[PDB]
Design a protein around this ligand. Structure first.
Ligand code: BR
Ligand code: BR
Ligand code: BR
Lengths: 32, 32, 32
């Protein structure tokens, strides 16, 4: 049942990807 | 041993959830 | 094949760790 834990891992990886980009936007906006 | 990798996946999902909410707070605070 | 899904879980955990620290930097910078 390697297949569907793999789906959850990927759902996490995707959420992380989008969070990283949003963080980067905030980083730029707070910076000088 | 599907059970405890599943625990780690969930520990990650939880950490992501809280990060997403904190990011959203920062997004609002940087915005106009 | 518990071993390499475990590698991906860890790649996620590491990405989360670094995101949490970057968020914390932004939180401090937006705060009063
Ligand atoms: Br994250
Ligand atoms: Br994960
Ligand atoms: Br942020």
């Amino acid at each position: 049942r390697m297949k569907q834990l793999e789906d959850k891992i990927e759902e996490n990886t995707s959420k992380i990807y989008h969070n990283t980009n949003e963080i980067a936007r905030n980083t730029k906006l707070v910076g000088e």
